[PDB]
């Protein structure tokens, strides 16, 4: 499935498809943008069946409900919610449009890449482990982005040799999404990604 949204400050696209033959998706996402800010999150539950979904879905719900909190506060609520559950890998991103500032916090193998028109990228390494309900030492990144920056957040079901190149070349989130098409046809795992193009 594909969901697109747009306002004066951002255009986004969410894509999600299940593993081939698999009824219950283990990945979840949440995204909301208004005229002032964006919140979004992508998670991949551990385990399988309903139990993977229960973990990543809990993240989706908490991010929606606590969207006004800082990313580190939100991700700690998610961690707490994992206590008697499978757990999940997850990434949370907030953007304030007027300041062109983003904040980001993640644990596990959900990746985030932000490409700037100047040619610099923010492309953090994955933090080992996952959100299990045990204590974590979070790393929050805060940075300014330039107009024209394009980003993706994706689960491990998307495996792309040179993700930066697709962000650089694409001139719209629809084009980038189309640019990634060959990596979505196998469906070896659930595949979720959120793309954004920032004004
Ligand atoms: Co996965």
Curated annotation (Swiss-Prot):
Regions annotated as coiled coil: none
GO biological process assignments: response to heat
Keyword terms, alphabetized: Hydrolase, Protein phosphatase
Catalytic activity: O-phospho-L-serine + H2O = L-serine + phosphate; O-phospho-D-serine + H2O = D-serine + phosphate
E.C. no: 3.1.3.3
Family matches, as Pfam families: SpoIIE
Domain PPM-type phosphatase, first and last residues per copy: 11-198
Gene Ontology MF terms: L-phosphoserine phosphatase activity; phosphoprotein phosphatase activity
Top-rank EC class of the record's enzyme: hydrolase
Annotated function: Negative regulator of sigma-B activity. Dephosphorylates RsbS. Plays a role both in maintaining low sigma-B activity during growth and in reestablishing prestress sigma-B activity after induction. Could have a negative feedback role by indirectly communicating sigma-B protein levels.
Annotated PANTHER family: PHOSPHOSERINE PHOSPHATASE RSBX
The protein, known as: Phosphoserine phosphatase RsbX
Organism whose genome encodes this protein: Bacillus subtilis (strain 168)
Gene: rsbX
